Design a protein around this ligand. Structure first.
Ligand SMILES: *[C@@H]1O[C@H](CO)[C@@H](O[C@@H]2O[C@H](CO)[C@@H](O[C@@H]3O[C@H](CO[C@H]4O[C@H](CO)[C@@H](O)[C@H](O)[C@@H]4O[C@@H]4O[C@H](CO)[C@@H](O[C@@H]5O[C@H](CO)[C@H](O)[C@H](O)[C@H]5O)[C@H](O)[C@H]4NC(C)=O)[C@@H](O)[C@H](O[C@H]4O[C@H](CO)[C@@H](O)[C@H](O)[C@@H]4O[C@@H]4O[C@H](CO)[C@@H](O)[C@H](O)[C@H]4NC(C)=O)[C@@H]3O)[C@H](O)[C@H]2NC(C)=O)[C@H](O)[C@H]1NC(C)=O
Ligand SMILES: *[C@@H]1O[C@H](CO)[C@@H](O[C@@H]2O[C@H](CO)[C@@H](O[C@@H]3O[C@H](CO[C@H]4O[C@H](CO)[C@@H](O)[C@H](O)[C@@H]4O[C@@H]4O[C@H](CO)[C@@H](O[C@@H]5O[C@H](CO)[C@H](O)[C@H](O)[C@H]5O)[C@H](O)[C@H]4NC(C)=O)[C@@H](O)[C@H](O[C@H]4O[C@H](CO)[C@@H](O)[C@H](O)[C@@H]4O)[C@@H]3O)[C@H](O)[C@H]2NC(C)=O)[C@H](O)[C@H]1NC(C)=O
Lengths: 215, 214
């Protein structure tokens, strides 16, 4: 017994990944997803706008049959990095015969003066040194907007064994988060250097890093 | 199960960890019904614990919404141990517009509870030139994710702290960090600050860790 789809399709819009918007070598994209498209009225057209001016995307929509007997259609719009970072509004309008009227969704970066992250590394608590692994902490305070990218390296090589908290709204309207890298105690004790790297739009060259090793 | 488009929807919410973990408080499970129509405003709730029907003394609260709908809230006070021992709480929602009653269930995450490891860390040396410094409480290795974290100075509750959501770690336990912002002058003169944690895996459901310059 398939869905009745009495309301017709629904549309959702998604922002680009922060790392894509912050790296010139990458191509950030805004994405418009349409769900609950019926087999009977399967055709979907997208119109894209930037600040209410129509733009073209050179990528045809991706159409996918779903388990619940519906169709899902995805339109992707590659954008200029500064269009996003300068706060322009991106709009997608969706056309479908099952719709009483075209559906519009809009998205843009959070408004307000960007504020630079202050990045700090902290070593393992003394209590932890007796275990097989220790925790290295990267504290990242005072940034805005919340869009940010955090990674860890060792010897110019990416580290994988880390977890980062969601960004948290602080009392002054800025955001903070922490990232925790788990490393073998032997690596810490022998003097390996670990680096927290951060990308955010308010940083010079959108990049900063802070290192830490046993003293 | 027959789903009505535009009809009411139900969401169920767990008790607050601090309520569950303090014998003096009363934890409650909450059932919220939204998109209730003006034409059919009456909503009845039935509650169950492990499928045994129970009564709540709390009449449902009906509230008009800015979006022209009605929202109805039902609160079920529960025994601390019913939550902590993993019983299933079920709310069944009755409304004339619904083709069938809507049911939602909730229970504590299953698995051996694991005790949080609590650590405090002082401010980065770089902050010392500022008018305020950040004190960090790192809390690792706990399960389930239900936890309460506060800060004190001597014995009084502190202001100006924020705590991250719990994050799922690589070994399936959870961690979080809490940040307390204090005047640099207070830190420099050796004031004592305390990170306090309540979690079901702790002895007496409580532990704390202090931090000061000396
Ligand atoms: C039949 O089966 C269908 C398929 O299963 C099913 O379709 C689903 O319908 C749901 C609604 O009925 C719909 O639910 C929405 O989900 C939103 C989030 O979904 C993202 O994450 C999900 C996992 O949690 C994924 O499953 C989704 O695919 C989606 O994944 C994201 O996709 C984007 C675009 O691809 C992607 O970004 C892009 O990534 C690429 C790389 O791949 C590049 O980097 C691009 O640059 C980049 O653009 C993300 O990576 C990816 N994210 C993740 C996590 O993976 C959710 O946000 C929606 O909630 C909002 O709306 C509801 C109700 O309207 C509100 O109650 C709720 O509060 C939310 O409100 C929004 O909140 C915002 C602020 O927080 C606010 O700003 C917005 O304004 C506000 N929105 C509005 C206007 O309300 C929503 O729940 C779901 O996505 C569908 N599933 C899929 C797979 O599409 C269908 O329902 C079935 N039909 C029937 C009848 O059963
Ligand atoms: C008309 O207007 C109404 C009112 O705005 C709209 O109703 C909304 O509908 C949404 C869905 O359509 C629904 O979204 C779900 O949200 C939940 C989480 O919501 C919590 O957090 C929100 C903030 O982010 C709040 O706005 C919500 O009110 C809710 O807050 C929580 O409330 C709890 C009970 O009061 C409270 O419990 C406390 O702790 C215990 C309870 O037992 C103690 O007793 C204590 O006393 C309690 O206070 C929580 O602490 C409190 N939490 C917070 C953070 O404040 C979300 O989980 C859920 O997402 C699930 O499902 C979606 C799919 O829908 C899925 O994508 C997710 O993966 C996930 O599984 C829903 O998104 C809103 O909650 C709801 N808003 C309200 C106010 O009820 C209507 O939608 C509007 N109608 C139309 C047509 O537009």
């Amino acid at each position: 017994p398939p869905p009745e789809l009495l309301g017709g399709p629904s549309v959702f819009i998604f922002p680009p990944k922060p790392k894509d918007t912050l790296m010139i070598s990458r191509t950030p994209e805004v994405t418009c997803v349409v769900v609950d498209v019926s087999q009977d009225d399967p055709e979907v057209q997208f119109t894209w706008y930037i600040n209410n001016e129509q733009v073209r995307t050179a990528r045809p929509p991706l159409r996918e049959q779903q388990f619940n007997s519906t169709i899902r259609v995805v339109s992707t719009l590659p954008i200029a990095h500064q269009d996003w970072l300068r706060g322009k509004e991106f709009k997608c309008k969706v056309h479908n015969k099952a719709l009483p009227a075209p559906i519009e969704k809009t998205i843009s970066k959070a408004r307000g003066q960007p504020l630079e992250p202050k990045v700090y590394t902290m070593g393992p608590p003394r209590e932890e040194l007796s275990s097989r692994s220790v925790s290295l902490t990267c504290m990242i305070n005072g940034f805005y907007p919340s869009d940010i990218s955090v990674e860890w390296e060792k010897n110019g090589k990416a580290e994988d064994n880390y977890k980062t908290t969601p960004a948290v709204l602080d009392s002054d309207g800025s955001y903070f988060l922490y990232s925790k890298l788990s490393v073998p105690t032997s690596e810490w004790q022998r003097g390996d250097v670990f680096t927290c790297s951060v990308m955010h739009e308010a940083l010079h060259n959108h990049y900063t890093q802070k290192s830490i090793s046993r003293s």
